[PDB]
Amino acid sequence: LDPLSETKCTLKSFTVEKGIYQTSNFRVQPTESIVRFPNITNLCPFHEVF
């Protein structure tokens, strides 16, 4: 809900004292788009051996 709530969840307490008591977490920028870049070619000799 806010930095204070995550700070509490990291401290496991409802009364945070004064300071920088918690390094809450890290900011991971999300992946917005997905990419698939394989090669190009033809079919395979599937049943040339089976």
Place this chain on the structure above:
Amino acid sequence: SALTQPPSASGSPGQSVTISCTGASSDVGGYNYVSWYQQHPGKAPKLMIYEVNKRPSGVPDRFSGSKSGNTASLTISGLQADDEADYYCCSYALSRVVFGGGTMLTV
């Protein structure tokens, strides 16, 4: 690819003739999947060549076979008046029998 053969061939008694065949296939088992069957007019065919460097038992030595690349050859050491019949090369490489188009033999 489907098998192909010459439309027909000609000869005479005592002469050594040969018949060709193209369009074979292959697999992991080898490349000797070629067999020739001679079918007389109006009766059941008969196996003449299998494993072109070989042939069934009891088969007369007047016939012989060989292969070269994607093309095969059926060699006959001598024709006879009764040798007038059809001949079909057949491939059984990929568990699929694909007979040939057929080629006529005459004198």
